[PDB]
Chains A and B, each alone.
Chain A
Amino acid sequence: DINNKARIHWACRRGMRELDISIMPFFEHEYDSLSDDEKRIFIRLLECDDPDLFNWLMNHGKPADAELEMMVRLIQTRNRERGPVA
């Protein structure tokens, strides 16, 4: 359910500070700019394990899933665009 934004917001609370900075602002600022397909892909990304999410975000490997890759690239691009988190 892509409209259940409250649910997805909780899935952005991680066990690493680096992911909190990388995912929560992205979700808060960028989620509504996403298409329906992108939104579903972001939800599936958050099911992945914290150390994988960190590594992929750091260009240390990549998921074996073309959709998740483009979502990682999206988060990276958008996070570089926003600059440091207030």
Chain B
Amino acid sequence: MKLPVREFDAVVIGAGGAGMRAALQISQSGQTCALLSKVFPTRSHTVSAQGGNWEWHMYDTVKGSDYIGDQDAIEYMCKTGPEAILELEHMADRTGHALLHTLYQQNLKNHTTIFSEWYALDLVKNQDGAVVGCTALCIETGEVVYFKARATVLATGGAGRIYQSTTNAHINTGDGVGMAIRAGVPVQDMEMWQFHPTGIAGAGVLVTEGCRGEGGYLLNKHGERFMERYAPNAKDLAGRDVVARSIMIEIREGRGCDGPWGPHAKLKLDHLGKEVLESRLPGILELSRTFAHVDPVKEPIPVIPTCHYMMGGIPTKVTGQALTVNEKGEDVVVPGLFAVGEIACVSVHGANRLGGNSLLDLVVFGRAAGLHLQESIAEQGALRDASESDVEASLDRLNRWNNNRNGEDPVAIRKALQECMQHNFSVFREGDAMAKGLEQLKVIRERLKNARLDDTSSEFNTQRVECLELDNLMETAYATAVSANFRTESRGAHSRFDFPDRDDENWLCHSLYLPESESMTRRSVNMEPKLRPAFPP
């Protein structure tokens, strides 16, 4: 090998709740584990989480999932959940940070090898198509290393930044998704993105529905309370699908307001008057002044639909093992590859994540991947060594950036992607506008192939990382777009204007984007719990 090789049993790519819980379990099992994180682990988006009979929990989760949540996966989560959480106790709020802090401290104690500020590039395959590690760069030095592994565990989190407005930290660029896709590994339910109808425009910080509950309402650029047109009875308290969609129709048909926040609708609160706002929405007043730079007491809050959670991802078993399909359309495990957390689609969330289960799945399925790793390694058997060209294949994308100093600005490409996704593939999904959108996305991705990297330096070259992240935004966005156009029904977070109803006859199923032909197929929803009869629709 020309490239330096670091060998471990497991290589965990990502140090949020999910990846750190898995790494802790792997190291506790006696096995050698490398933990990679592009940021110091306590700066994972997990840090943003706040707030802190099992069959009831299961029922709520299946129901909330609109019945494309896998019942066996959900049962495992709800039953095992409480044990899993207390195991951690036995070792803005601090709830996200404390989870990260504990898992970080434990990983060190149990001699997990931590590679903080290292950026994973692409999965390494062998001649048989098994995953045998990844290539990653040291952000401090620019050194590139092949992390050779029997098990490679993707735990990279979400990808809200495919859209213009997200609650997600800017590190959330879908790197695991891009990595899976380019390796030929499918992704599931990528149309299932949870949106909030009103985040602060230019920020993405959520503005509570309580603002509308209190009497607030939405204005377009003419000061028309436009929800009266789209929802004559419910108005600004209509379903979140309707309120969010309506805002984007308004923006895309030119009636959006604009200014330094970019395009938006105005959330008018000032008619409520000073005392009730300070009494009943004192937090919204401070959030607005700081991040919208407006005082709601006098001016409306600029808002726009905002992307929160990725229910889709790499399909997995309860064991963390990543799945694909064969030409019979049957599940078959991808040897050497695993996924845990928000990057995964085990599918405890189906069509709509339910509050608290996003922290819970991290620990339950983080741990389960670790608990079963040895058995999974035994299942896949000894994997052949990656050859030198196998490793070089995983560097190709990197090499193209490093040989293009002149060409198109990636920042502009990113903004075009995000606008396209927001206009055509967020909360307004309609067949004609999506057909155009898909073609626009092909134009944008041809431009990304002639995109420049200005900074040729090796040490702390952020621009190179940001360029590499854009390739992953582009893959995650295109998969989402193709999936969204495919599912001709409305279910949960996927709302279609041209197909407003839920269709259990044709679409009680998962969507599955197949990267080798970029085409779609379906996969069955598990309806077979072990301890409990199935919950029917």
What is the interface of chain A, defined by CB distance below 8 A to chain B? 4, 6-7, 9-10, 13-21, 24, 49-51, 54-55, 57-60, 79-80, 83-86
Contacts and interface: CB of A to CB of B under 8 A. Distances in A.
Interface in B378-422: none
Nearest to B48: A16
B293 interface: yes
Contacts of B94: 49, 51
Interface stretch (B167-175, B477-485, B502-510): B167-175
Contacts of A10: 39, 117, 139, 460, 462
9 contacts: A10-B39, A13-B170, A14-B47, A50-B43, A51-B93, A57-B290, A58-B92, A84-B202, A86-B262
A28 B232 CA distance: 46
Interface string B446-481: 000000000001011110000000000000000000
Contacts of B42: 15, 49-50
B218 interface: no
Contacts of B168: 17
A6 B460 contact: yes
A17 B97 contact: no
B331 interface: no
Nearest to A24: B170
Nearest to A60: B92
B47 A6 contact: no
Given A51-B96, A51-B97, A13 B43 contact: yes
A84 B293 contact: yes
B537 interface: no
B47 A16 contact: yes
Given A6-B461, A21-B291, A51 B170 contact: no
B181 interface: no
B38 to A, nearest CB: 8
Contact of A15 (B171, B286, B293): B171
A21 to B, nearest CB: 6
Interface in B169-208: 169-171, 201-205
Contacts of B292: 84
Contact of A83 (B117, B262, B293): B293
Interface of B: 39, 42-48, 92-94, 96-97, 117, 139-140, 166-171, 201-205, 259-262, 286, 290-293, 457, 459-462
Contacts of B140: 7
A20 B97 contact: no
B92 A17 contact: no
Most chain-A Cβ atoms within 10 A of its Cβ — which of B171, B260, B460? B460
Contact of B290 (A9, A17, A51, A58): A58
A10 B39 CA distance: 8
A56 B166 CA distance: 23
Nearest to B415: A86
B43 A58 contact: no
Nearest to A49: B97
B93 A13 contact: no
A54 B291 CA distance: 12
Contacts of B460: 4, 6-7, 9-10
Nearest to A82: B293
A21 B169 CA distance: 9
Contacts of B205: 17-18
A61 B19 CA distance: 32
A44 B154 CA distance: 32
B171 to A, nearest CB: 6
A83 B97 contact: no
Given A14-B47, A21-B291, A84-B259, 6 more contacts: A15-B96, A20-B170, A21-B203, A58-B92, A58-B286, A84-B260
Contacts of B201: 84
A56 B58 CA distance: 39
B204 A17 contact: yes
Given A13-B43, A51-B94, A6 B457 contact: yes
Given A21-B291, A83-B260, A84-B202, A15 B462 contact: no
A60 B190 CA distance: 38
Contact of B48 (A15, A49, A84, A86): A15
Given A49-B97, A51-B92, A51-B96, A14 B293 contact: no
B457 A15 contact: no
Given A7-B460, A80-B293, A84-B202, A15 B43 contact: yes
Contacts of A15: 39, 42-48, 96, 169, 171
Contact of B169 (A4, A14, A49): A14
Contacts of B202: 84-86
Contacts of A60: 92
Most chain-B Cβ atoms within 10 A of its Cβ — which of A21, A54, A58, A84? A84
B463 to A, nearest CB: 9
A45 to B, nearest CB: 14
Nearest to A57: B290
A79 B290 CA distance: 8
A51 B204 CA distance: 17
Contacts of A49: 42, 94, 97
Q: Which 7 A-B pairs have the closest CB atoms?
A: A6-B460, A15-B47, A84-B260, A15-B43, A51-B92, A84-B202, A20-B170
Nearest to A16: B48
Contact of B459 (A6, A20, A50, A86): A6
Nearest to B47: A15
A50 B44 CA distance: 10
